[PDB]
């Protein structure tokens, strides 16, 4: 009863089209973020998903009241009837303000005109990536929000408390498959748009990729294919179709693994770290078949040694060399590879 | 202080018909535009389109909004753009666009004491391309964005790129993963229809494709598989299973590469350049098995009625023919 005429008295002399203190001073908006669940980081789109309860607060002198209550916890219809800063995420792609079952917005008015206006957002944000250490890389995924129409002279953003404690990531909402979340970095910036200067808040979420999926699906297949293509030496030199079928099939296996591992990725112009590994392993399996061609150039007979003993063939010299040469070079390459890239 | 501003705004818009072009019987309005491109997200050959995010901005001088006394520029809430005139500009290349919604509908109204109004939109559109992929993946793709007034003809509305060549900004900040923008042009022209002549603008890029991704994925394993087709020349004619297995396995590997590239790529009627190259490599691979059939027939069939001379000749012929083919190929397209 009383609160009806209180709210009517508030909306009597009110305009929701112009900033509080339009010709007097800046409007200090005190922003705040509660990250409930940091959603899955789509590499192919170079994006990620985040769901946040987006807090804002400012002071409007026109919304002072006196009554039985201190704070008016209200319906979001009145939040649509009142000025609200046009905060937009600078790197959102297709972001959704949830309205099931009602628009998830709370407006709270304390009696001295200090508004609280929190939304519940899902921001499909744009994280530019440097995948040159794929998959053993790590990079900062930013989240940057400013006003759209109000300059530095009109609306200035802050954080409610100290910046690194303001943005809170909740614990139950991991929602990450590959990446790990090592922490955020809360800051503040200024842009220089054609229209004018603006205040830009910034959080940089830091993500290091777990390489367990990529080891299992790409590295151990390539490693065991190379182990196979080096097992071919311990056959004899006379089993020409055995070593022939052996070498060209492991080549086919490496070609299959090549295309089916590069598929899990965007189409960048350089070569990633997994590309270096796949190319070197494919060079080993290529060199195994060139080695057998070099063996078969010097065969000089047609049969092999019978168990009961004409001449025979000896075990060839490049066979005895390559049995020790190629697994040693593969072990050296593994040492150099997994000491180089697990440094960064 | 502030009630004067509210009074000024309320006396601007009382008696303001928003269904009327400014100077409704007189000269056309000179609507000037401005594009600040945020990103280009995907450039899809499958759907022949690309997603473009931009800060699309428009100036025009609406003479019925010319206030007085207030020394500043009236930056208002976005919902007062419902109570103004705005131009009906659309995009012909557009498939599915949206003004962003979080946290509000991203509009701006910035009034000026001469009556100039700015209307800014963060638009993420999806513009179409007639991609000519005959030189794929060694092509320069041209893609446009055709801005045009819908209802008002050239007698009612005029479009100029405000700033000349520096209207569209943010082009140099775009780092597409597999393209490289060479040029963007800014074309202003009138377009006739059955209903009249309308002003069209044209932001229009040129996307040149980075070429290293396909060398890694397709070209280099094609070269090395075609090379490993030639191990049969260093194997005896007696070893039948050896030469037949490598020749059969290399036509299988070329089959797998081509099936992967036909799964990636759209349904185009001609033969692309990467398909010309795989057809050429498959010709070498197929002839590397026809050679063994030829050798087997000459020895075992025309025997009682040279053999090693075929291998000695072909070891010189096939690397020379393959290098000659790559010479003609990579000097035709590159």
């Amino acid at each position, epitope marked *: 009863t009383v609160f009806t005429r209180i709210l009517d008295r508030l909306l009597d002399g009110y305009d929701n089209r112009l900033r509080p203190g339009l010709g007097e001073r800046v409007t200090e908006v005190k922003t705040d973020i509660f990250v409930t669940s940091f959603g899955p980081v789509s590499d192919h789109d170079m994006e990620y998903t985040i769901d946040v309860f987006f807090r804002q607060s400012w002071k409007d002198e026109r919304l002072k009241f006196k009554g039985p209550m201190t704070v008016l916890r209200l319906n979001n219809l009145m939040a649509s009837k009142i000025w609200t800063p046009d905060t937009f995420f600078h790197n959102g792609k297709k972001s959704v303000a949830h309205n099931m079952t009602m628009p998830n917005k709370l407006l709270r008015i304390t009696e001295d005109g200090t508004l609280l206006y929190t939304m519940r957002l899902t921001v499909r944000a744009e994280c530019p990536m440097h995948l040159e250490d794929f998959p053993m890389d790590a990079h900062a995924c930013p989240l940057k929000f400013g006003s759209y129409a109000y300059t530095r002279a009109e609306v200035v953003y802050e954080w409610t408390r100290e910046p690194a404690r303001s943005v809170v990531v909740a614990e139950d909402g991991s929602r990450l498959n590959q990446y790990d979340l090592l922490g955020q970095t809360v800051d503040s910036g200024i842009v*220089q*748009s054609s229209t004018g200067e603006y205040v830009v808040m910034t959080t940089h979420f830091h993500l290091k990729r777990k390489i367990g999926y990529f080891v299992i699906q790409t590295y151990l297949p390539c490693i065991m294919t190379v182990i196979l293509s080096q097992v071919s030496f311990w056959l004899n030199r006379e089993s020409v179709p055995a070593r022939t079928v052996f070498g060209v099939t492991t080549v086919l296996t490496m070609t299959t693994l090549s295309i089916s591992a590069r598929n899990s990725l965007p189409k960048v112009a350089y070569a990633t770290a997994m590309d270096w590994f796949i190319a070197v392993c494919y060079a080993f399996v290529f060199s195994a078949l060139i080695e057998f061609a070099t063996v078969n150039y010097f065969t000089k007979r047609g049969y092999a040694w019978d168990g009961k003993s004409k001449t025979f063939n000896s075990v060839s010299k490049i066979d005895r060399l390559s049995r020790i040469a190629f697994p040693l070079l593969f072990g050296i390459f593994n040492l150099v590879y997994w000491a180089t890239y697990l440094n960064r | 202080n502030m009630s004067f501003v509210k009074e000024t705004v309320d006396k601007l818009l009382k008696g303001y018909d928003i269904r009327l072009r400014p100077d409704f019987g007189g000269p056309p309005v000179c609507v000037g535009m401005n594009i600040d491109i945020a990103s280009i997200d995907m450039v899809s050959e499958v759907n022949m389109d690309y997603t473009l995010t931009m800060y699309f901005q428009q100036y025009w001088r609406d003479k019925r909004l010319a206030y007085s006394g207030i020394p500043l520029n009236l930056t208002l809430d976005n919902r007062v753009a419902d109570q103004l005139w705005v131009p009906d500009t659309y995009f012909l290349n557009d498939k599915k666009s949206f003004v962003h919604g979080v946290t509000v509908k991203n509009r701006m109204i910035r009034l000026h004491p001469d009556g100039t109004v700015l209307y800014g939109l963060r638009i993420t559109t999806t513009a179409a391309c007639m991609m000519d992929l005959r030189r794929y993946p060694l092509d320069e793709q041209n893609c446009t964005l055709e801005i045009e007034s819908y209802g008002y003809t050239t007698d009612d509305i005029e479009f100029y790129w405000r700033g000349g060549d520096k209207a569209v900004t943010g082009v*140099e900040r775009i780092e597409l993963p597999q393209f490289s923008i060479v040029e963007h042009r800014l074309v202003s022209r009138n377009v006739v229809f059955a209903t009249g002549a309308y002003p069209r603008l044209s932001l229009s890029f040129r996307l040149k494709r980075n070429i290293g991704y396909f060398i890694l994925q397709t070209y280099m394993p094609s070269i090395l598989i075609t090379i490993l087709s030639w191990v049969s020349f260093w194997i005896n004619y007696d070893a039948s299973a050896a030469r037949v297995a490598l020749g059969i396995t290399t036509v299988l590997t070329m089959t797998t590469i081509n099936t992967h590239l036909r799964e990636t790529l759209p349904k185009i009627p001609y033969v692309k350049a990467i398909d010309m190259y795989l057809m050429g490599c498959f010709v070498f691979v197929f002839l590397a098995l026809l050679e063994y059939a030829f050798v087997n027939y000459i020895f075992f069939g025309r025997g009682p009625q040279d053999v090693n001379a075929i291998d000695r000749w072909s070891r010189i012929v096939f690397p020379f023919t393959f290098s000659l083919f790559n010479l003609v190929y990579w000097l035709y397209y590159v």
Partner: nanobody
Amino acid sequence: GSLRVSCAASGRTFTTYIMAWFRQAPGKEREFLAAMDQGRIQYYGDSVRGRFTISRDYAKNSVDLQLDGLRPEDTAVYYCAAGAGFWGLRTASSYHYWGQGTQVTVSS
């Protein structure tokens, strides 16, 4: 006085990268002056907030720290930096590419 300290890169386009300027006073103290993101966002240090202006040219791959209001305490070495800011923009270890440095000396 005023000064325009530039940094013209080559070998890699750093448009994606956050090109920044560092000040090193004598005392082994790399200090973060200014850095600009790919999306035209200027980040300023606390001691220099409102004095220096940073501006990149993404065509020419440069960063241009404009100097103004030069106190005698700005006598130090000015490094051009570049990186991807993992645990970045406030730390010197986040940058994996560096300039040589330049002593800028103020005489009062």
